[PDB]
Design a binder for these strands. Sequence first.
RNA 1: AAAUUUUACUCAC
RNA 2: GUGAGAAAGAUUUGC
Lengths: 315, 139, 515
Amino acid sequence: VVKVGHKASYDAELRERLLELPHPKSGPKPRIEWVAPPRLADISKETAELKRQYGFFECSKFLACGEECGLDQEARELILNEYARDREFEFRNGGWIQRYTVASHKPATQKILPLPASAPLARELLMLIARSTTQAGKVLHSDNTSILAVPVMRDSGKHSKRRPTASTHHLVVGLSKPGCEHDFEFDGYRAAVHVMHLDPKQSANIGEQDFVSTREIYKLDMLELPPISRKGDLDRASGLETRWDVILLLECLDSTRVSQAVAQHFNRHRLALSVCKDEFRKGYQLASEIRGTIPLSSLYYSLCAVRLRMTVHPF
Amino acid sequence: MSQFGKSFKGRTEVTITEYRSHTVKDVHRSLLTADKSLRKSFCFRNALNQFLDKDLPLLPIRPKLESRVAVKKSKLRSQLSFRPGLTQEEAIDLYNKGYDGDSVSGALQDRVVNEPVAYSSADNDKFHRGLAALGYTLA
Amino acid sequence: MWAFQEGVCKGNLLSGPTSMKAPDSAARESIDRASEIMTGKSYNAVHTGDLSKLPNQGESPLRIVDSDLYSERSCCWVIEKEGRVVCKSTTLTRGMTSLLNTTKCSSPSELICKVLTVESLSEKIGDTSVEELLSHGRYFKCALRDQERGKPKSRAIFLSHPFFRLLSSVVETHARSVLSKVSAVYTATASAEQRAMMAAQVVESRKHVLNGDCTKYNEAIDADTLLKVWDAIGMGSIGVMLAYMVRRKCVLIKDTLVECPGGMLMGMFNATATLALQGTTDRFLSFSDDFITSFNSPAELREIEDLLFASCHNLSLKKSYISVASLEINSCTLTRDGDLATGLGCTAGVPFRGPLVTLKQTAAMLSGAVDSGVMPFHSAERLFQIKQQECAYRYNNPTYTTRNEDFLPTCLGGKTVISFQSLLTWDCHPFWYQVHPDGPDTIDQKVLSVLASKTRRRRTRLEALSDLDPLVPHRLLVSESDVSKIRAARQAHLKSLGLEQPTNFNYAIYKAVQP
RNA sequence: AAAUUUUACUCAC
RNA sequence: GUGAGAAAGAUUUGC
Ligand SMILES: [Mg+2]
Ligand SMILES: [Zn+2]
């Protein structure tokens, strides 16, 4: 019976071949210095660096979709359909399609979104994102808000694609209160129209999150949440405690879930007595790891949450 | 030509393991494309319709758990509950009664479940899944 | 909100990152890191520890488990169209079947016995030789591993050849056995919490606890280290062939083959590297790239660092830290006395995937949370009710249901909001048994399993051979005629009984119903 | 046009 | 929508 340690007749030849192949060289021995974990000043410095490098948008583009606009169902449908027509979207089989020919092949501009006051329509927004990206082309209505998912397809002339497939992206169009550069008007109806370009995996990830259960589970054994300003700064005078919900919604909209990396590193911070010098700090610098407006805002507000915890409930 | 000679070209006999592996439709995977798949062709709707009138009125009624004991919060420990598999004669009878052969074969093997529990009783008895905090005992 | 928790929280409530990014960038980055480590300028890939402590297993019979060589998971199968290598993405079952067809062997054990017992590398085994097998087994395909919490940039995973998998199965089985013999922590039947508790017991004496992670773990584990471990435990020529294939591996990125002479390609030999650390010292408790150790003085810490460096386990300066009242291992956090640390911990949320799968997974998660004391039972009851309401709000529409039976859940057009305690005690309608974590599979799960069976990579025209007699050993050989007779007899018996299809069997329900 | 090498394939029925 | 072919199609994506 053959045993595992059996030596084949070709063992020597294979060993010689391995010997003749390249081998690694001994690496340099690292020098490790153990210091105290970072303080409030370091997290403030990281937040300031993000703010200085990227800046802020004039409005919360799609986070503003978490608050009800001042339009009824019919007005919302009319506004969305007329916006789709205004952008020269192709209409076929009763549905809207966005056609593209040439791509700049450069990243879109990234800034930090200011926080809206609240996100009452978070559950509805996530459900609508899921449903619309599952069935796209037409306006879908909730009890208080509407959405439009438009497949993004290539333009190839006469035989151009007619039905989206599993790899086709979607432009999700939502409505919010006017008062920004994205305002749109039709027959006396005004609304800010904001767009989000998602690949199908991204939209599926966003739509499957449970906002209410997550909020309750977090609220089970959490400390008092302080009011914060539009930029995530502590403001006990003009701040709001509902903005935290908005932050949660942001974490649901960010398909890269960088807030999870920040949370894991903050757990390490809270459980640590001593950390490596100059290396544990770098774990909070995640801009290179992500790309886009929504991921950048999520990272910024995760760092702001860490800062606020270190400020109001120091450990 | 037969599919046996196409999938197993050059071989006339194969183990039942390989042949069964080639036709597997009982492995579930939790994936992002779940709601889309369930909506496609109303597959879940039709499956629910079929279950409600073909598969539901064959499930035996299971008695509800009754016995429970007083428990107190304690240090985290591991509860080892050993559930034995079906005996040979039991498996033969279940097969001859029309039950799925694969499920019976899977139930043949004895197994042990290791679960973390943070509750204890006076007599140190095992608890049911998720009912340690209430004191329901395996008995 | 995770930042304002009284206890510990990893922020696991939401799903992990995902996207449709191509895996080329991540694979190229990993290969470049491996090459740099090979140069000897970034990290250490040269093993200097002594492994003579490990027992030799060279006299053990060569046993192969056929069950784990067939799976629905992906693999790379290599063919030669005209004069060039073509790598095809298949399932492990199809790849192994193609390998056995080319080699003309009944089972993988027969194939490995034939391979180990040839006179020369050029000798033919069916339509191939050992040389051709070794050449083909060094090819890997690259894919992206997504939904990994805490990794916004997804890592690259690699699909290997069926022959590589066949050899790795034996190697890893024997490495796991040696690990289990080395310490009781590495026992086959041990949970993450049990391992963490054993670790807490093993580090109680010392004052400081070093919770460490290894950076670039896969890139810094050379074929030399794998061969060293395999020779230490006595893996014979199987280890030599595996090391030869690993040293000469190539990865298909997009449409080009890239050679990667360093590393082991993303956790192919976790147990072997764990042995590479454990066979040199007994002061560590490591699980691949995550380890925990204890010390009292800076001299002991320097000794720990030396041991880690000598075993090619490069410390992660970004994540590794030192604690005095905490213990993190396998993601499980414990106090120094072994009790669970207060807080959510690793509690993970349940996304919306199917009306009933979501409820079943939520029930399982809540059962786990309440059993370990993460939350009290009434909180779990409230959360279960909330999840039922959310599922009703998401799924109660004509797309998913057309029913109005009262006993049904509200999410399927019913009017029943089951209590968590009532569900856990089986005090409910039989329709709810599937929602029990220990109960049968749900309707969504069966539907999705069948649809998956219908996919392009898994679709087959073979006559299914299911619902088999338990007495038949799965190692028995059958022909087309044999399967035809088996299917005919089973169908005839089922029709005689009056059942169109076999009745589903549940172990828990059957045992409970018994007197 | 956007979270920008992604939002693309062919044949037959 | 179904079958097959492009290093390839959604259980994708491995240990
Ligand atoms: Mg660790
Ligand atoms: Zn705007």
